Amino acid sequence: KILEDPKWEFPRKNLVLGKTLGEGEFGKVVKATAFHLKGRAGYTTVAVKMLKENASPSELRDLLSEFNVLKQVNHPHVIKLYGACSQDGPLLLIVEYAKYGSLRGFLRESALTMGDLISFAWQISQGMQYLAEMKLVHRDLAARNILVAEGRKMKISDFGLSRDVYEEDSYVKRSQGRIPVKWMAIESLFDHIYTTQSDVWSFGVLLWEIVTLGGNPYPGIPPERLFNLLKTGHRMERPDNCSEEMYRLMLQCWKQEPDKRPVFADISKDLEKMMVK
Amino acid sequence: KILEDPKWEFPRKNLVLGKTLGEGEFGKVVKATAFHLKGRAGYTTVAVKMLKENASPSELRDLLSEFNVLKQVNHPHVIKLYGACSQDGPLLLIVEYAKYGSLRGFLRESALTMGDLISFAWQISQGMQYLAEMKLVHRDLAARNILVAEGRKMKISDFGLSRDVYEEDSYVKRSQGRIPVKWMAIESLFDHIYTTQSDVWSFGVLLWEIVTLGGNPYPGIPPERLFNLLKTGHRMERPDNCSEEMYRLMLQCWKQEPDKRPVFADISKDLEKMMVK
Ligand SMILES: Cc1ccc(-c2nn(C(C)(C)C)c3ncnc(N)c23)cc1
Ligand SMILES: Cc1ccc(-c2nn(C(C)(C)C)c3ncnc(N)c23)cc1
16 A cells, blocks of 8 residues: 655656666666656666565565655766656566666776776765755665766665754654664664764765775674674774875864764865865 | 574684585585594585675574574484584574485476475474474475485475464564465465464475475466466366375465465374375
8 A cells, every 4th residue: 555646656667677776675777768767758778676476564664765865866976766657566676777786886897097986986975965954864875885887976775774964754753774784874873873973974884985996894793793883983994095184084074073073065165176176 | 692502613724625515695605624523534525605795784693593492402404503603703503415406496407206305394394393393483494495415315404484383582673574374374365373273284395395395386476466366266276196195185284264275294194195106
């Protein structure tokens, strides 16, 4: 029983699904083509996300949660929602198509200069600054949760775990322990507290992933040992393809006090100062 | 911070990990060899389960939950726990090794006669009757959660979501919506009620998977539409490789009233009557 919003409902007969682009804990995403989308004559190459054959109740809640947050945002660096098919069969979410795939895969498949990586971090920081202005916390901010559309333009994705900056619900059942530990902020890891400043912590780990072309954060460190490491003040070390100014930004994102961490508005200007220089 | 039980702690220096056997929502399972296990001189081919590099707090809780339930059971058709490495690094669970892999994959890879399939259902019903005697509900009973060791002997696995038949804890934080809908009992789907009779419902779906050699239950039916179908009394249809007596057993497992469903003790005798005849 899903409410069908007419502003986003799309006819299933006007949608042809193609080959599977990926399947896992996120769901089932297939490539597809949608004709007469948004009233524009012709067809459009899109991406359709659906539940798996072995989906659980929580898997639907995330797809509906992802559906809600995508109806409310709009940004050239946040994946765009085009339509949905909530009636007469399976639930399909029709969104923008990212040719080059997820960012974690795109970085691993690599020729990219250091200017290309700072551009990626700049785009992600731009969209995140917008989400902060939209009163949203992403929580699940990582390299795997970022898409790469055509033009190598970064697109923020996976809003199934996102919450409001101001809780606008009388009773919200709390999701528990669904954020990977190595991307969790120390206060989120210690008291289940997720904020925009916690996304900055997650963004700092994202910077580490980009400068390493899809590296595994805290290498060889069991995630069950990371709480003790972060509680004592230990962070990650300087990687190989990192400058003195770039590594300083990661540590500012990893400051213990969330007030001592920069906001995404400052991160965008800090990263542009690296692009110009 | 994990408590190290000396009855199950095993030295990491006495364990060599090999190639990865599988990775996903369940965790990371690698093939390995353990020397001087259980005091027996020599080495033993085992399987080691560990957390992923992007594991979340709940992923650890399941591994610890799976660890607890495996310390307490023993059956030739339930996977056997051999040891663990909870100190000085990553958390490793050392259990029995299943050469032929998961049951869902083993059925799909297939020459098997109808007698071979009833034998598999018999073995799974035997171990489940034992778990019911051990006051345990498995909940996540499916074909993917069953292993096939050497000799094509069935081994019940994945106890991360298992609960006690009698709740022996003052405050237990409830996991929510982690069982795939198509395997959920109608009362579990309607009021979050998981019991041994609900495992019989799940076992009936497992029978359907075996007689179809790893088929997808309720084919072409969106899992969001299954609650309405089961609430109106509709079940699955007779498959192709199913007898009149075998299909009757599935429907008895799918009876609305859980008291109207058979117990695993009767299922073992019902399946043996098919093996003899
Ligand atoms: C709502 C929604 C829908 C689809 C996706 C998505 N996942 N993925 C994979 C997982 C294949 C990289 C994609 N690859 C390309 N384009 C996409 N749009 C996606 C993400 C969110
Ligand atoms: C505690 C525990 C440890 C390992 C496994 C396990 N998963 N898997 C896959 C997923 C590769 C089929 C296995 N394949 C063979 N043998 C095994 N033992 C396993 C299950 C539970």
